Design an enzyme around this catalytic site. Sequence first.
Site, short mmCIF file in Angstrom:
data_model
loop_
_atom_site.label_atom_id
_atom_site.label_comp_id
_atom_site.label_asym_id
_atom_site.label_seq_id
_atom_site.Cartn_x
_atom_site.Cartn_y
_atom_site.Cartn_z
N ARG A 49 -14.09 -14.82 2.22
CA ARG A 49 -13.69 -15.43 3.49
C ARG A 49 -13.54 -16.95 3.40
O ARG A 49 -12.69 -17.53 4.07
CB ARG A 49 -14.72 -15.09 4.57
CG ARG A 49 -14.93 -13.58 4.80
CD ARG A 49 -13.74 -12.92 5.48
NE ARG A 49 -14.01 -11.51 5.77
CZ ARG A 49 -13.97 -10.54 4.87
NH1 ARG A 49 -13.65 -10.81 3.60
NH2 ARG A 49 -14.27 -9.29 5.21
N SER A 57 0.82 -1.20 0.00
CA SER A 57 0.00 0.00 0.00
C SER A 57 0.86 1.26 0.00
O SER A 57 1.99 1.26 0.50
CB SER A 57 -0.90 0.02 1.24
OG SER A 57 -1.49 1.30 1.42
N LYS A 104 -7.85 -0.49 -9.82
CA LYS A 104 -8.62 -1.08 -8.73
C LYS A 104 -9.74 -0.16 -8.23
O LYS A 104 -9.59 1.06 -8.21
CB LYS A 104 -7.66 -1.42 -7.59
CG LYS A 104 -8.28 -1.94 -6.29
CD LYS A 104 -7.17 -2.43 -5.35
CE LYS A 104 -7.70 -2.96 -4.02
NZ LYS A 104 -8.01 -1.88 -3.04
N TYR A 138 -1.77 5.52 -4.55
CA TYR A 138 -2.80 6.49 -4.19
C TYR A 138 -2.15 7.79 -4.65
O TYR A 138 -0.96 8.01 -4.39
CB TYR A 138 -3.01 6.58 -2.67
CG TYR A 138 -4.01 5.61 -2.10
CD1 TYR A 138 -5.26 5.41 -2.71
CD2 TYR A 138 -3.75 4.94 -0.90
CE1 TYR A 138 -6.21 4.57 -2.13
CE2 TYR A 138 -4.70 4.10 -0.32
CZ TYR A 138 -5.92 3.92 -0.94
OH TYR A 138 -6.86 3.10 -0.36
N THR A 171 -5.49 2.68 -7.24
CA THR A 171 -6.75 2.58 -6.51
C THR A 171 -7.51 3.88 -6.75
O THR A 171 -7.03 4.97 -6.44
CB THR A 171 -6.51 2.38 -5.02
OG1 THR A 171 -5.83 1.14 -4.82
CG2 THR A 171 -7.83 2.36 -4.25
N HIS A 182 -13.80 -1.77 -2.05
CA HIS A 182 -12.90 -1.47 -0.94
C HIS A 182 -13.32 -2.15 0.37
O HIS A 182 -13.22 -1.55 1.44
CB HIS A 182 -12.85 0.06 -0.75
CG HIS A 182 -11.53 0.58 -0.28
ND1 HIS A 182 -10.64 1.21 -1.12
CD2 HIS A 182 -10.96 0.59 0.95
CE1 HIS A 182 -9.58 1.58 -0.43
NE2 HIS A 182 -9.74 1.22 0.83
N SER A 238 -13.27 -8.12 -1.97
CA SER A 238 -14.40 -7.62 -1.18
C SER A 238 -15.39 -8.68 -0.73
O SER A 238 -16.26 -9.11 -1.50
CB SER A 238 -15.14 -6.51 -1.93
OG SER A 238 -14.28 -5.42 -2.22
C1 LIG Z 1 -7.56 -2.17 7.34
C2 LIG Z 1 -7.75 -1.99 5.86
C3 LIG Z 1 -6.88 -1.06 5.13
C4 LIG Z 1 -6.96 -0.87 3.69
N1 LIG Z 1 -6.02 -0.06 3.02
C5 LIG Z 1 -5.99 0.03 1.67
C6 LIG Z 1 -4.89 0.75 0.95
O1 LIG Z 1 -4.00 1.32 1.57
N2 LIG Z 1 -4.95 0.69 -0.49
C7 LIG Z 1 -5.98 0.01 -1.29
O2 LIG Z 1 -5.92 0.02 -2.46
N3 LIG Z 1 -6.98 -0.64 -0.60
C8 LIG Z 1 -7.00 -0.67 0.75
N4 LIG Z 1 -7.97 -1.47 1.43
C9 LIG Z 1 -8.94 -2.24 0.62
C10 LIG Z 1 -8.38 -3.63 0.27
O3 LIG Z 1 -7.42 -3.57 -0.73
C11 LIG Z 1 -9.44 -4.60 -0.22
O4 LIG Z 1 -10.17 -3.96 -1.33
C12 LIG Z 1 -10.55 -4.97 0.76
O5 LIG Z 1 -10.10 -5.24 2.08
C13 LIG Z 1 -11.23 -6.20 0.23
O6 LIG Z 1 -12.28 -6.70 1.12
P1 LIG Z 1 -12.23 -7.70 2.29
O7 LIG Z 1 -11.60 -6.95 3.43
O8 LIG Z 1 -13.62 -8.18 2.60
O9 LIG Z 1 -11.35 -8.79 1.77
C14 LIG Z 1 -8.01 -1.66 2.90
C15 LIG Z 1 -8.90 -2.56 3.66
C16 LIG Z 1 -8.81 -2.78 5.07
C17 LIG Z 1 -9.75 -3.80 5.68
#
Ligand SMILES: Cc1cc2nc3c(=O)[nH]c(=O)nc-3n(C[C@H](O)[C@H](O)[C@H](O)COP(=O)(O)O)c2cc1C
Lengths: 353, 353, 353, 353
Positions: free
Chosen positions: B285, B105, B228, B128, B153, B252, B282
Amino acid sequence: NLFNVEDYRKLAQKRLPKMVYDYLEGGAEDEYGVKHNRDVFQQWRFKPKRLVDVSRRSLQAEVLGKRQSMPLLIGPTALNGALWPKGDLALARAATKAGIPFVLSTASNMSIEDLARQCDGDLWFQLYVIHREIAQGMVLKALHTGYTTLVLTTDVAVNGYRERDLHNRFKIPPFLTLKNFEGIDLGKMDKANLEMQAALMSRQMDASFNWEALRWLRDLWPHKLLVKGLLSAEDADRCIAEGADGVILSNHGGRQLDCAISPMEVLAQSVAKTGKPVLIDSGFRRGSDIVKALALGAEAVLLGRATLYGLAARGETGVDEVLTLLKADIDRTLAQIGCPDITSLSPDYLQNE
Amino acid sequence: NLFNVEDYRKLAQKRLPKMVYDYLEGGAEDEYGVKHNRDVFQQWRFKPKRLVDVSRRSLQAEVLGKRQSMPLLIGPTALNGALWPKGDLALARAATKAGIPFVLSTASNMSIEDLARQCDGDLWFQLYVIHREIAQGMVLKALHTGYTTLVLTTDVAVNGYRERDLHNRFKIPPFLTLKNFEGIDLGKMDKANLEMQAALMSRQMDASFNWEALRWLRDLWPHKLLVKGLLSAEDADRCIAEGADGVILSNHGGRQLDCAISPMEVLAQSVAKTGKPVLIDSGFRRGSDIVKALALGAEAVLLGRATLYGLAARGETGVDEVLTLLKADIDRTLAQIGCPDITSLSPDYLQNE
Amino acid sequence: NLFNVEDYRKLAQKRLPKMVYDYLEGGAEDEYGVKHNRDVFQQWRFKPKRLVDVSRRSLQAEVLGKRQSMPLLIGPTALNGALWPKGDLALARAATKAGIPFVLSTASNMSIEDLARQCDGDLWFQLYVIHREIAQGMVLKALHTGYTTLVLTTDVAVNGYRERDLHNRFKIPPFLTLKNFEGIDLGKMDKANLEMQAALMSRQMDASFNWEALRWLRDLWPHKLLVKGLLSAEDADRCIAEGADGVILSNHGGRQLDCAISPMEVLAQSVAKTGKPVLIDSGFRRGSDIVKALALGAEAVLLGRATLYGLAARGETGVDEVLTLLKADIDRTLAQIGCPDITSLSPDYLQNE
Amino acid sequence: NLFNVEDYRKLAQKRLPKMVYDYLEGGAEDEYGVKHNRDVFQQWRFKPKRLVDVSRRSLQAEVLGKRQSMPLLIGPTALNGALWPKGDLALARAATKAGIPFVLSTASNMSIEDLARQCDGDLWFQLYVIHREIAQGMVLKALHTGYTTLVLTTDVAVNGYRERDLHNRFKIPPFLTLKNFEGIDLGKMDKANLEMQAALMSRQMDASFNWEALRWLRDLWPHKLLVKGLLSAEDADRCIAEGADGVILSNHGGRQLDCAISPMEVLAQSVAKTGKPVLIDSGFRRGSDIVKALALGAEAVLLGRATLYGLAARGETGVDEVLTLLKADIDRTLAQIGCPDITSLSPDYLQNE
Ligand SMILES: Cc1cc2nc3c(=O)[nH]c(=O)nc-3n(C[C@H](O)[C@H](O)[C@H](O)COP(=O)(O)O)c2cc1C
Ligand SMILES: Cc1cc2nc3c(=O)[nH]c(=O)nc-3n(C[C@H](O)[C@H](O)[C@H](O)COP(=O)(O)O)c2cc1C
Ligand SMILES: Cc1cc2nc3c(=O)[nH]c(=O)nc-3n(C[C@H](O)[C@H](O)[C@H](O)COP(=O)(O)O)c2cc1C
Ligand SMILES: Cc1cc2nc3c(=O)[nH]c(=O)nc-3n(C[C@H](O)[C@H](O)[C@H](O)COP(=O)(O)O)c2cc1C
């Protein structure tokens, strides 16, 4: 922790006497209606448009040809004074500060004239007809004091069966009064002034008000006229045919007929059929609810209980806060779905679920 | 008892401070989105093909033309260091041991260069854009240190309204820092280096990044580029038209727009329309969730919270365990539906419910 | 109060050690499958035919051309001895007293020969193939001892992921044994008798058993052959094309693949496509569930857990009681919908919900 | 707080012995039927017609060509005396005071003759056939004492499986008796009067009563004849073809077959196909439920448990109160949907959900 409308509802429930809270929150019979009003919004989900420049967003929009800060209004609600001292004024001033209209109820605690004298915002008047002559009097009063728009509410031909009120033996607060019916002459005899006095000593409204009566009202009022309480594209269309400048689809916040459809169910059809402004209320709590309605063609959304929670919990400042949260909510939502200009909303941003 | 992802979530909730757990598990507003992300998988059930020799199974698959152990990736997540010491490295090493990519990230706790120096697996960089010039700097850094793929993203034009964080006054952990923004010169005056310094002292990102800006990024990055945060076949298709090598359908993890559709709702359509790699995340699980997506045409599935539960609960070993369980889960599922080779998955194994 | 199957489940849960109850009641992973197996029956409701003489009713029906008391069978279930002493015999004798077949599991506690010697009812043998040579041995044993029908179970290519067992570290009861694998020579060296010994010291079954292998089995067994574990009309049809005399649509009582469809979802289609006997199991608890399946074309319904609750709670007498209740339940149902003869059932008595 | 039917149910549950309450409220098996009977009404919502003069409303309507105060009837229910002393008379008198018919059950506690002598309202007789000769006797008795309409109940070929009764070992109240079977000669020998005596010492009714038997009954009764217990347009149509003057769609209040469809599911079709009066019952509790049925074409709605709650809780006065509340409920509903005359109801006021 006041971060959304629900938080204000919670605070309002803690500050209001149970009887008053129930008067506010209650719905008709089983309250399946109010629940449906909320649940129906889940029938649509968002399909954002990515890579759209949303660095400059605008919530400004024309409602009935007149520009306002955002497609929202504080709708007409009776006995606001029971929720907070000078409740009608608090709401009106918060709406004015937010740049949106405020609609005064026929059953308000502050008179038509007093409000107009203490608030220079865009004031609308919602009319209930109990007695024709008396109704004509209020309509002219609203006209002479600067009210820009007249709203006829047609869904209270008879009182809704709200069982919470029955359980609490809810009685109109003592320190309050239906101010707009004040001064209405008495002591006079003969036909009216006896026929009339009888009608106002009754809790029932004019259940005979029909299309012909609407034509009567249409000729009496020279400015914008909206008919509120419609639940079908057919009725909306007839209203336009009879002279109305627009309509307000609504089931009265689920307070009149528990099994009535949600106005969201006929929003798109009413927009397509009438070709005129279609406003709407009933069940709106989140900015997403509002954006979904606007995306389906709604001209604007009127708030009922949402802003009343702010009023009951923290007075005028409470209303300001709820409107601020809702505005930021709508703005945030527009940014996330990729529609920087609120007037560009379309069904293309929605997915039927 | 650690037999599935949920078991790790439970253990993570017991070991993490509430504030951090909420930062991790939380979703936008009412959290109807995260629930929908889970529930949507029940819209499909399996129709196994019996009497198929599944004594020899293979989970090996090409992602963007490059072979890996299984169609999974550890997606980009910010502040991993708040979940476990050197969290970014723990995740990267577990992904590498499992034979799959790890996406760093922009808001990671370990810098682009440090990770590349300590991990020789397939490293991807998620970008980002807060300031164009600064973004260009990170992109080139990732290119020079061996990152194979760039992921832009696009669904954080503005911050999601996550009320758990608001209730906890969530503040970025003290012992942590957005390392990738380190060293970024200061003390300089004039336009940028003042205009720029202003942008980085802001929690908001570049909300103006549009299609034209994507073309800019496309010419800057010579390797595989993925976009994304898409939630429509139309946007996915436009991304390909603009030069992207593939897309990642995603909402997300329900953290940005509570009422957004689940990417699973446009997966098949995006696959059919773009004809290019369509990855997705997304709500995943269970291995069955993953297999359903792959059967609908997904090139690979990125894990977000699933592997973070392993990290938070038991560090690097925890991530290894979650990936091991998920691999065995996918393998077991392939055997049970009669599809020995994961690349042979098709909609024919599914039943719409 | 033992008036239905659920009442016996309750009593069984009170008498069985938790570990054993969980082995019996448990399903794969989240157990959404077992729930779906029950819920799917609500997709159909009855439309009774009134004024039909139902004073004389008949539940008698031909299954694979052979007449039996009612369209039911006690299906194959392993380790019945863990539920009640000599469980296999108790079930077989209750089935025989009821006038219906009993299917012995390959993993039974009583051997093929011992049961046939102690029970003269219609005995069927369910085969699991771990080692071809060993399977051939059991098949011939069943043939030589009078078993009328052979049932090949194809949905256990790999073991289902039943987390209750994992949590309890469920170990095959000590006082019990897989009797049918007894005597199977040892001490011998070379290829098999080493290759074979290895396969039987493994908890995994032959995952390579395919269509060609079915042809092999078809030539080995001279009587009625059914393939169990199918979940598609296509597979059912192929089985018939390969020589099978009928099929058993089933998802193994939700114990193998949590997201598998319920066999009820492909029952009508399988009946229409194959034109051969289509039996079914998984989720049947009420007589109404059974009648719905029969009305959709099912030749007969096999009971799994239903009769096991009777066994676990009250032994042989318990099984007799459950079968008595189910028979009276089916009979009562036929009378109420106006179909006196069970063989006259059709989709005309059902309403899709 | 007695503001609706549910309030009376609550009071009835507090005053009745559990055994009796269960006899009254109970349904067949899992009671999914009674729940479905209630839930199905939510499949329709109202679309009010605004600006209609509803100052003068009428609930008056013709049922089988005869005018009555409102489209309601108190349906036939057995053992009313177990709910309140002289229950049959209390119900009959309340119905008469309300201006609607009362249907006496064959299994009533007050005889056909006694009621007719003590009540001059419109009395209907519901017939159950246990023995042909005995049935003929009651039919003629009803004819000679002034009963205007005969109702044949066809959905009790066999007794419903009501598990609450089984759990309570429910025994017909001691102080009560099936009065209509009184005096029925005994001591006589030979065929009947032995064959007959046997049938009446049995809890089972004539399960052979078919279409031919209906023709027999049709020639015996000279006035209006209705067939009750139908759940298909086809059966309703056949009944008309065989001489019936109308039908009563019903699933016996969910007391006979738990998975039977709700009669609301075939109401519109039965109305369209038969072209004759289609009455209905089962699940009606709110005025809205009743109005929905009437809007779909129902001639009238029969009340079962609704008025029994009034009876059990407060006797005759209780029934009067429930009928008063229901009448005002229907009236209020007509006003709110804009249909002043109940005979003007149509599907146009409904929205399928
Ligand atoms: C704690 C947390 C931090 C995240 N930070 C970022 C990030 O820095 N960049 C990004 O592209 N997506 C970010 N995401 C989104 C994830 O890439 C991903 O789309 C998402 O967690 C997918 O869903 P899930 O948590 O049900 O697997 C974040 C998600 C969580 C839960
Ligand atoms: C306490 C309360 C009083 C109301 N009084 C009036 C009134 O005087 N005139 C009117 O036209 N509508 C009246 N309404 C209906 C509102 O204008 C509006 O239709 C409704 O509240 C919208 O639904 P919502 O509460 O879910 O926002 C009232 C609603 C509430 C909750
Ligand atoms: C405790 C238990 C053991 C089982 N053992 C076997 C077996 O040895 N062979 C087989 O073909 N099926 C086996 N099955 C599956 C059953 O034959 C049947 O498909 C299943 O129980 C049907 O679902 P129901 O339990 O809802 O009736 C087993 C099921 C249970 C509950
Ligand atoms: C306590 C009780 C006794 C009943 N007895 C009879 C009877 O003797 N004859 C008959 O035709 N129906 C009988 N019924 C069925 C009713 O006529 C009616 O179909 C049913 O109650 C309608 O449903 P509801 O209870 O939801 O209104 C009985 C129902 C109840 C609840």
